[PDB]
Amino acid sequence: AVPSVQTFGKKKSATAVAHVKAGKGLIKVNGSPITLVEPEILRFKVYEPLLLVGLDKFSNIDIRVRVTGGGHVSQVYAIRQAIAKGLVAYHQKYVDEQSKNELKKAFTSYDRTLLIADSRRPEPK
Template sequence: MASTVESVQCFGRKKTAVAVTYCKRGRGLIKINGCPIELVEPEILRYKAFEPILLLGRHRFANVDMRIRVRGGGFTSQIYAIRQSIAKALVAYYQKYVDEQSKKEIKDILIRYDRTLLVADPRRCEPKKFGGRGARSPALSDVKDSSSPEAGVGVVAALQFLPDDISMERSLGYDSFMSSRKIAIEGESCWLIHLDFGSLMID
């Protein structure tokens, strides 16, 4: 009767990336999606994937083979999911097939360096809210606050084309005007209006 293979399977997560590691007794091979871990991309994040090995030493991985499948997320999230699944798989293998003391030593080293090597990071990007530019920042208003020191100081010139028989105040909805005068532009009657922001009436 064939002996059962000593193996464990663990997963690591980061945001939407999921890495599943199948760990069994072997001779120290670690492959990610069929490629050796030494060729993992991007190169700038390669040492992140190597962190469990560098922390614990090659001798602890000498008698196991690991096959890792990762999907989802981006490059950075996948690397963090890979390192977590490697660490969790080794801890689970030592707990099941070696001894509790060795497993505890490995776990303490990993936790002391970075807790996310064994515990999933629950942080997520907060979604943007309607009416604003982002998750938290409020929408900027174009209307000046009448209580601010600048209110009532700034003066703007506006052109409004109006028939002669319509009241300028009633049509524009402003309570008071600093000054106004009627002019003619290209044969049309219009008002050149200087508005006081402090007296702006909003219904």
């Protein structure tokens, strides 16, 4: 058995369950790496989890996700939530806490709701 954690990432209707397992750093979307995505301009928004805490961070793990539902904007917003949540879930269980506190501080300071999904509940005032 390998060290592995699994989480999820949710947009309005998009569902993306992550599989953060050990390895050498493969990061794939349903069969495919990141640099092929098309939207192709929203590639930089899912580039962001590589970037806000330092690039390297991945030589001991492997990433595989899959998406069911949503739209092309909604699908990319689903996974990039799940990457940052899936990253710290490994630091939740194997790595020490204070490293993860340094990760979430780098995350929350720039946070575009990377750690929380959108829910809309209206009310008249």
